[PDB]
UniProtKB/Swiss-Prot annotation, chain A:
It comes from the Viruses. Attaches the virion to the cell membrane by interacting with host receptor, initiating the infection. The major receptor is host ACE2. When S2/S2' has been cleaved, binding to the receptor triggers direct fusion at the cell membrane. When S2/S2' has not been cleaved, binding to the receptor results in internalization of the virus by endocytosis using host TFRC and GRM2 and leading to fusion of the virion membrane with the host endosomal membrane. Alternatively, may use NRP1/NRP2 and integrin as entry receptors. Changing F5S: In strain: Lambda/C.37, Omicron/BQ.1.1, Omicron/XBB.1.5, Omicron/EG.5.1. This is Spike protein S1. Binds to host ACE2. RBD also interacts with the N-linked glycan on 'Asn-90' of ACE2. Cleavage of S generates a polybasic C-terminal sequence on S1 that binds to host Neuropilin-1 (NRP1) and Neuropilin-2 (NRP2) receptors. Interacts with host integrin alpha-5/beta-1 (ITGA5:ITGB1) and with ACE2 in complex with integrin alpha-5/beta-1 (ITGA5:ITGB1). May interact via cytoplasmic c-terminus with M protein. May interact (via N-terminus) with host bilirubin and biliverdin, thereby preventing antibody binding to the SARS-CoV-2 spike NTD via an allosteric mechanism. Changing F5L: Increased resistance to neutralizing antibodies and human covalescent sera neutralization. Residues 34-49 are annotated as: Disordered.
Length: 49, 48, 123, 108
């Protein structure tokens, strides 16, 4: 009494509506900064003019 | 809640409540009320 | 804080008839069950009779079946008990207790009691 | 329960034709059907998973469509190695993974 388990299980079923269907979420956090960068978009180098 | 006699399930009693302060902690603080299922709103934020 | 006033007690000869009145004023009487119980002068409590909120379900003690009858007046918020065919064992004290529920035979027991009235059955 | 019906059973065409096969359900299954190709001499292979999602590695000639109670598969090219038996399977109803009857395909 007055004590609840904070974890509740989502009961996903194929008979549910769109508003209750499970959705997979992937969130990308970019550490975009002046620091030495290591994740680079595909690009071609060029001679040093 | 503390009524001596309830009506039948087919003739379920409907009571309208307004223009007063509703203390939901009283219902939350009575042990005999074993079953407290709520949907569409969190029981903790009922007070606010 | 509710009030339970009982009257009708006294001394009567065996085989006579009398009436006991129990009136309540501290609560709503139209939806509560009421009971008459007996405490012997030298023994413990014993249930006698009782009536529900409405005069539909009625019960009596087995030892007093066919002898005692009860009535309930919701207009004046009280009840009456008719004492008939009294014998030597009915010289005990009688209480007027209020049941917590509304029916006659429920696991809920008597909630509030009243001061007993003394009756005597002797010559 | 659920019942799946195959309106065509044996179909004849040529190497340069276009063929269609339909699978009907007793009630709506919400586009949850799969199409399987079964060669008589080797292990059967899946062609379509879901209503209209094409499995990787198979030619784009096959095309699935339909939603609700009826579903359809179409071949536009009919390459000469497309001889097999085609099945429609539901995965939505309480009877788990019930399959429909076979659908023979022959070229002539």
């Amino acid at each position: 009494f007055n004590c609840y388990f904070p974890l509740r299980s989502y009961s996903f079923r194929p008979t549910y509506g769109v508003g209750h269907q499970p959705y997979r979420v992937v969130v990308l956090s970019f550490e975009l900064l002046h620091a030495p960068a290591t994740v680079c978009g595909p690009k071609k180098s060029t001679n040093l003019v | 809640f503390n009524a001596t006699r309830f009506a039948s399930v087919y003739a379920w009693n409907r009571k309208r409540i307004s223009n007063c302060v509703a203390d939901y902690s009283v219902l939350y603080n009575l042990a005999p009320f074993f079953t407290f299922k709520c949907y569409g709103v969190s029981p903790t934020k009922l007070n606010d | 804080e509710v009030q339970l006033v009982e009257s009708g007690g006294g001394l009567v000869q065996p085989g006579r008839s009398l009436r006991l009145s129990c009136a309540a004023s501290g609560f709503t009487f139209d939806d509560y069950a009421m009971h008459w119980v007996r405490q012997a002068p030298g023994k413990g409590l014993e249930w006698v009779s009782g009536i529900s909120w409405n005069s539909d379900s009625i019960d009596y003690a087995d030892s007093v079946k066919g002898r005692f009858t009860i009535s309930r007046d919701n207009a004046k918020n009280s009840l009456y008990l008719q004492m008939n065919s009294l014998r030597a064992e009915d010289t005990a004290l009688y209480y007027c207790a209020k049941d917590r529920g509304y029916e006659i035979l429920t696991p809920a027991s008597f909630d509030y009691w009243g001061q007993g009235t003394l009756v005597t059955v002797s010559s | 329960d659920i019942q799946m019906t195959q309106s065509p059973s044996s179909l004849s065409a040529s190497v340069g034709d276009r063929v269609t096969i339909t699978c009907r359900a007793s009630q709506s299954i919400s586009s949850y059907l799969n199409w399987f190709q079964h060669k008589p001499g080797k292990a059967p292979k899946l062609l379509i998973y879901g209503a209209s999602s094409l499995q990787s590695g198979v030619p784009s000639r096959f095309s699935g469509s339909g939603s609700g109670t009826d579903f359809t598969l179409t071949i536009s090219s009919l390459q000469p190695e497309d001889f097999a038996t085609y099945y429609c399977q539901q995965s939505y109803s309480t009877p788990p993974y019930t399959f429909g009857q076979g659908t023979k395909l022959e070229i002539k």
